[PDB]
From Swiss-Prot, chains A, B:
Palmitoylated. Depalmitoylated upon L-glutamate stimulation. Ubiquitinated by RNF167, leading to its degradation. This is Glutamate receptor 2. Detected in forebrain. Detected in dendrites of neuronal cells. Expressed in the pyramidal cell layers of CA1 and CA3 and in the granule cell layer of the dentate gyrus. Disulfide bonds join C204-C259. It comes from the Eukaryota. Residues 118-261 are extracellular. The record marks R62, R146, K238 as: Interaction with the cone snail toxin Con-ikot-ikot.
């Protein structure tokens, strides 16, 4: 029995720095959905743990030249972290080199606009040029478009990969900031979960439009062959069944809404 | 390399007998979402297979006295089938004795009424007595209510377990038949997937009402420690990503709709 190093990422409402964080030390610097979930998984698996923010601030992609994984995936892979507890999407390129528990939350790629933007769908975006759009770097959303064989999404990806200036953003906060400050002339593609939280946060100037483009989920990830893999997974199933996963969704989404009803 | 025995269950639109089935032999007797999915999993894993309907017609529960599993779970457990490819819900009591791939489709428990029934929610059902309601025997929906510690669902379960005549049904077709032929005086609790298919099938006299009561999914199941476990799971992830899972949902739900738009 050894203290587990948890890799995670600063992403609202999953993991956020408390406002008085310079007061505080350790796990107490952080609050969020995945902070709460880590404390539940650690209880049901019987371990002690250290929350730690991914040094490079990325989710995880592999450089096509070096074949080096960055982000939280690379933290696991190179043995710097023992478990990743974060909105980290379950994908094939990833499930190869790490293990994922069953999905604790569902999401699909969605479109965020400034209120008033004449865009209702992904089709609407691919058929025009006035409103720019993009995704996050180093993540599952970017790769969905890169590797897509569907007509509209390949059209979107060819626009996106060569557009000037860049339509790609380093953090979600950056994509959101660009929607808000671009006067309706940028739309952001992000996961439905993140979009729905932000949609209900002041200044209440963004909106989610269109149906989800895919159906995926987030998993707890452990390095390939870890002894934490099976206990962690039974713990997700059990918290599902206890209603604890729904209760934490309500806490950090619905109860945090500032944009009316 | 040996021919895989697939256990599955007659449930619309997942697996149905073709109308000329007495013409036909083998896998060709059957059509459906899970028929199509079995053919994809078998291709991507490189195996040959036999579709076979569970002899007892159940999903899988364990007798509390004998501790014997019935249904498709018990077919796997006692080594009669090699893989279960069906709308079989991923649960903790089950993930113990069998392995489940990641979820290929999502569902929640939902409420089906005859059109015109004054019921909008699960709360509405628990607070009245004129309209009877129940679930399927030997399945995850029945166990959700039995083991629930939430107020409304425990209230529902206490009513349901001792109501006369029985509110429990052996097959989904039976629950649906009871809604249709009970003049609004029975409501059925079933998975949202099954409800949404039936809702769009003639005589177009049922309706799904209220939000889902839980968030679960169906998995492909193999006996604990099978060599098919990891290939099958990579195949679900890959078909997800190829869009094949969405394409098969559309085929057997949206394209099969007879109740207008
Ligand atoms: C293999 C890929 C398709 S995936 O990304 O891993 N799965 C997708 C599709 C889907 C379906 C349902 C659910 C919901 N769900 C929650 C739980 C609780 O562990 C579960 C449980 F695992 F228990 F079924 N499901 C999520 C997702 C995302
Ligand atoms: N959850 C995604 C990041 C968000 C996005 O790509 O939109 C990932 O794990 O890569
Ligand atoms: N899919 C469920 C059966 C349907 C239901 O219980 O409503 C199971 O695997 O047990």
């Amino acid at each position: 029995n050894k203290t587990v190093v948890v890799t995670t990422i600063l992403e609202s409402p999953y993991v956020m720095m408390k406002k008085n964080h310079e007061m505080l030390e350790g796990n107490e610097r952080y609050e969020g959905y995945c902070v709460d979930l880590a404390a539940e998984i650690a209880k049901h698996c019987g371990f002690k743990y250290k929350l730690t923010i991914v040094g490079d601030g990325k989710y995880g992609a592999r450089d096509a030249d070096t074949k080096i994984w960055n982000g939280m995936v690379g933290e696991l892979v190179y043995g710097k972290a023992d478990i990743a507890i974060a909105p980290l999407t379950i994908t094939l390129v990833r499930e190869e080199v790490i293990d994922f528990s069953k999905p604790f939350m569902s999401l699909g790629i969605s479109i965020m606009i400034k209120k008033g933007t004449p865009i209702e769908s992904a089709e609407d975006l691919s058929k025009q040029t006035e409103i720019a759009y993009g995704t996050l770097d180093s993540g599952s959303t970017k790769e969905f478009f890169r590797r897509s064989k569907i007509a509209v999404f390949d059209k979107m990806w060819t626009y996106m990969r060569s557009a000037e200036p860049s339509v790609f953003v380093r953090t979600t906060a950056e994509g959101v900031a660009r929607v808000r400050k671009s006067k309706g002339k940028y739309a952001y593609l992000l996961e439905s979960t993140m979009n729905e939280y932000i949609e209900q946060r002041k200044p209440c100037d963004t909106m989610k439009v269109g149906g989800n483009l895919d159906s995926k989920g987030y998993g707890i990830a452990t390095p390939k062959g870890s002894s934490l893999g099976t206990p962690v997974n039974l713990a997700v199933l059990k918290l599902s069944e206890q209603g604890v996963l729904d209760k934490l969704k309500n806490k950090w989404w619905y109860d945090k809404g500032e944009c009316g009803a």
